[PDB]
Structures are given as structure tokens and as C-alpha cells.
Design a protein around this ligand. Structure first.
Ligand SMILES: COc1ccc(-c2ccnc(N)c2)cc1
Ligand SMILES: [Cl-]
Ligand SMILES: [Cl-]
Length: 330
């Protein structure tokens, strides 16, 4: 319960509720010292949420100490303080999220050209998080966690480092939102920064088609929707996976296949080529003839996405090399 007009610490005047989370709530507030509006993320007064939010504060302050071009795709933490036994994180105000943007297209998607602008900003963010001394895994990339800087413009920033961890500081095996969950996490394997790049691949297809690429209703369904597009994962990965046998069965000759329950397209037959409509006027044919939606434009996009959706986290494309892809050229 926070009321409009409520004044905190002779500094902040609470205006309105921006959003609610598992973590607590985010409110619009006026800062009298800086003379500007800010977003205040108010964590619930329960050990679990406080402790995870203390990790979010540490990771944001760690990024803020690195002044470089690439850090300006991450929402700015201005400060944090403790009030009425709630940890409170003060951020810059951003605009609406990319799910809202998709809802506003009635889930028909934005252009290849706006998708490219989002791709390039998000690839730069991931390059920043991969800075050795940072090595931050977001762990929850999805459209909802990508906000416009300004409702008139196509600049974006990532929010919500509530799930985030540094490489080698993993807490939970079960992480990421199901639609954006990487194969290595579905398979219960130790995960690295490559799980964010998997999420990003999923996100960019969704931004252009308007619908999630892999909309599993549970982990079994999720892996089955991935297999439809990408085929059976390579044996070398499945051999090292604790949860391989949640989804696949090993045969003595001809190593792995799907476990079948009661009655999906055959492995690797739901081609990304058709989902994108590379040769058939884009998703549902709705970009037929539009500029920036040529077959050559489409093939570049398909190639970058399939590199982002490599099953092998060690060969999956990394941010620097994604930024050099032809999809971003001239
Ligand atoms: C509208 O402005 C904002 C700014 C930050 C956030 C934010 C920041 C960090 N975590 C979450 N879940 C949300 C939301 C809206
Ligand atoms: Cl979504
Ligand atoms: Cl998570």
C-alpha cells in the first residue's frame, strides 16, 4: 500500500504504480533534489526478495563503475536506500516494454528494419555484460524486460537484473522464462552468458512475426517445440546433460531420439525459413513488396538467428561477432 501524494524522506513524492513483479512493485515518483521523475523499484520486506534484490543492486553498481560506450543499453540505477524495511532501487524513467509494442501491432510484428535496430542495441548490451570483469548473465531476457527509452523513439534498455548472476556465481538450475529458456538450462547443465544470446534469438523472431517462436506450455512441450525447428540436439551435448532423459532416449546404435508420449512436426521440419516467410513475403505474407523486406534481407536475418539458436553454447554466436554479421551492414 503506497498512496499518491505520499512524501518520502523530504525527497520523493509518489505519483502512481508503474508495475508489479514477483520482487515487489515499481512506482513513478518525483525527485525534488535532481528535479526529475524517477522509477522506484520497491522490494517486498521478505528475506528472499531482499537478498535477491541486494544481488541486483551489487550487479548494477558493478556495471556503473565501467564508463564505456556499450554500458548505455542498461537501465541506469541512480541510487538505493532502505525505507520501512523495504530495499528501494531508484532508476531513470523509461517508457513501455517490447511486449506492449507487440500487443500494439495486434501481435503482427514490427518491420525487419525496427527488428534490426533492436537486435543491434541488444547485441551491444550483451557485449557489455560479457566484459570479463563483469561477466553478467541476465538470465531473464524477454520482450517485457526490454523498455523503450522514449515513446517517440526506437532506443531501448534492458531492465530487471533480479535473476542475474556473474559467471561462476550460479544459484538456481531452473531459470529464464520458459519461452526464452535455452537448451542447456532445459537439460539441467551449468550455464554461461550464451543463455542470453539464445533468449535474444527467440526475442527477435517474435518481434518480427508477432508471436513467440517456442511457446511451450511446460518444459517437455518447450523442448519439443525447439526440436521441431532445430532437430535433435547433438549427442555430445545430450551425453553430458543431467535432464537429457526428461526429453530424449539413447539407443545403442543411432544415439538419440525424442521420447514419445501420447499424440509435433518431425524433428527439424518446422523450418525458420517458412516461419520468417523468407521467400513468401515475410510472416503470413504481410510484408510482400515493402522496402527492407527483400529475400536477401530475410536470408541475412535467418542466418544470424540460426547462429543465435546454436544448440552448442560454446559455438553459439557471441555478441562482438553478432555485431559484425552482414544483417547489420550498410
Ligand atoms: C517505466 O520506467 C521503468 C524503469 C525501470 C523499471 C524496472 C527496473 C528493474 N526491474 C524491473 N522489473 C523494472 C520499470 C519501469
Ligand atoms: Cl511474451
Ligand atoms: Cl529466472
Amino acid at each position: 500500500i503506497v498512496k499518491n501524494g505520499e512524501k518520502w524522506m523530504d525527497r520523493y513524492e509518489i505519483d502512481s504504480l508503474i508495475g508489479k513483479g514477483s520482487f515487489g512493485q515499481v512506482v513513478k515518483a518525483y525527485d525534488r533534489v535532481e528535479q526529475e521523475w524517477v522509477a522506484i523499484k520497491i522490494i517486498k520486506n521478505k528475506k528472499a526478495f531482499l537478498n535477491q534484490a541486494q544481488i541486483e543492486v551489487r550487479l548494477l553498481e558493478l556495471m556503473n563503475k565501467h564508463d564505456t560506450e556499450m554500458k548505455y543499453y542498461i537501465v541506469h540505477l541512480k541510487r538505493h536506500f532502505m525505507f520501512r524495511n523495504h530495499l528501494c532501487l531508484v532508476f531513470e524513467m523509461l517508457s513501455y516494454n517490447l511486449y506492449d509494442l507487440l500487443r500494439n501491432t495486434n501481435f503482427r510484428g514490427v518491420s525487419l528494419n525496427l527488428t534490426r535496430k533492436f537486435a543491434q542495441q541488444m547485441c551491444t548490451a550483451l557485449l557489455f555484460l560479457a566484459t570479463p570483469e563483469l561477466s553478467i548473465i541476465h538470465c531473464d531476457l524477454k520482450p517485457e524486460n526490454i523498455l523503450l527509452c522514449n515513446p517517440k523513439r526506437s532506443a531501448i534498455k534492458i531492465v530487471d537484473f533480479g535473476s542475474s548472476c556473474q559467471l561462476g556465481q550460479r544459484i538456481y538450475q531452473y531459470i529464464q522464462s520458459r519461452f526464452y529458456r535455452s537448451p542447456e538450462v532445459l537439460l539441467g547443465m551449468p550455464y554461461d552468458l550464451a543463455i542470453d544470446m539464445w533468449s535474444l534469438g527467440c526475442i527477435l523472431v517474435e518481434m518480427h512475426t508477432g508471436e513467440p517462436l517456442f511457446s511451450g506450455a511446460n518444459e517437455v512441450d518447450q523442448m519439443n517445440k525447439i526440436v521441431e525447428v532445430l532437430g535433435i540436439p547433438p549427442a555430445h551435448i545430450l551425453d553430458q546433460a543431467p535432464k537429457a532423459r526428461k526429453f530424449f532416449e539413447k539407443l545403442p546404435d543411432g544415439t538419440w531420439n525424442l521420447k514419445k508420449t501420447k499424440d509435433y512436426k518431425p524433428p527439424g521440419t518446422r523450418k525458420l525459413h517458412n516461419i520468417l516467410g523468407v521467400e513468401t513475403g515475410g510472416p503470413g505474407g504481410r510484408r510482400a513488396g515493402e522496402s527492407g523486406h527483400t529475400v536477401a534481407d530475410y536470408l541475412k536475418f535467418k542466418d544470424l538467428i540460426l547462429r543465435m539458436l546454436d544448440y552448442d553454447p560454446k559455438t553459439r554466436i557471441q555478441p562482438y561477432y553478432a555485431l559484425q554479421h552482414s544483417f547489420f551492414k550498410k
